[PDB]
Design a binder for this molecule. Sequence first.
Ligand SMILES: OC[C@H]1O[C@@H](O[C@H]2[C@H](O)[C@@H](O)[C@H](O[C@H]3[C@H](O)[C@@H](O)[C@H](O)O[C@@H]3CO)O[C@@H]2CO)[C@H](O)[C@@H](O)[C@@H]1O
Ligand code: CA
Ligand code: CA
Length: 131
Amino acid sequence: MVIATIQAEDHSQQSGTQQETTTDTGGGKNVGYIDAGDWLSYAGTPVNIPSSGSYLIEYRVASQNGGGSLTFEEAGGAPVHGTIAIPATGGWQTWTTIQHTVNLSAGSHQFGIKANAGGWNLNWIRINKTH
Ligand SMILES: OC[C@H]1O[C@@H](O[C@H]2[C@H](O)[C@@H](O)[C@H](O[C@H]3[C@H](O)[C@@H](O)[C@H](O)O[C@@H]3CO)O[C@@H]2CO)[C@H](O)[C@@H](O)[C@@H]1O
Ligand SMILES: [Ca+2]
Ligand SMILES: [Ca+2]
């Protein structure tokens, strides 16, 4: 049911953030120092959506104090697919997976993430079928 897993650090463009080592399962890196206005683009790795309809988007996140939120969209800002609040997890390297649904059109997508409020780290994103 997995369409794509995208490691958050594997962006083709970004604004305002920096990579750091993660102690989450699998190791590697996460994106940190996320604040309002910051963004991540995955335009360099287009993802194919096989059919129009509902998809589940998952985010592997960590947050010391909570208060964060993001917008999932096409790279460049539009169309916007959805928004999600990012809860406190207990620490900067205490990880949990959050999710929401969005509608996506069939075909090739270039995704982006805009931080509306900071306070969180991001390890990876996953796009899944519902259907
Ligand atoms: O959706 C996230 C944010 O996107 C920002 O636009 C950027 C795109 O995400 C990014 O992919 C694009 O990259 C260009 C690159 O600048 C150019 O050198 C190359 O030839 O083509 C790439 C596109 O394939 O850059 C833009 C901004 O310059 C929005 O600015 C932001 O609002 C939005 O949240
Ligand atoms: Ca920042
Ligand atoms: Ca990662």
